[PDB]
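Exercise 3.2. Students should predict the tertiary structure of the chain below and write it as structure tokens, then compare their answer with the key that follows.

Predict this chain's 3D structure.
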Amino acid sequence: MIDDDGYRPNVGIVICNRQGQVMWARRFGQHSWQFPQGGINPGESAEQAMYRELFEEVGLSRKDVRILASTRNWLRYKLPKRLVRWDTKPVCIGQKQKWFLLQLVSGDAEINMQTSSTPEFDGWRWVSYWYPVRQVVSFKRDVYRRVMKEFASVVMSLQENTPK
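Answer key:
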């Protein structure tokens, strides 16, 4: 889906545990790594798209998550023109991203990377929140560090409440 003017709305998910580790995964047939994410379908809300795309990425469903935080501002970015697909219509030049921190309810056991017959991810790991930002390129880094910092303050207190 693209909205109209070559932007498209998008959402992403972060999970942490009470050790201050965040989930990270690696998409099938890539060897590069990302936070779980997906597009808002036309007429979805950001939170509905979050729960939908969570199922598509992690196989996880609403039952075994809770929203602990979400981005107050949208993390927008423009692509460099090498990645722009001028040949197709409408052309994408950027997206707005809303992110959501959930805590896993049963823990990492409730992840299934093969929702479809094809695994959507080739790999997954749990990592400290700042480690991830190191692997990505400049414009994804900017988003990924925002995604971490925006929710980081909840994670500290989420280790201490041991909000159960």
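Discussion points: Residues 111 and 127 are 16 Å apart (CA to CA). The first strand starts at residue 7 and ends at 16.
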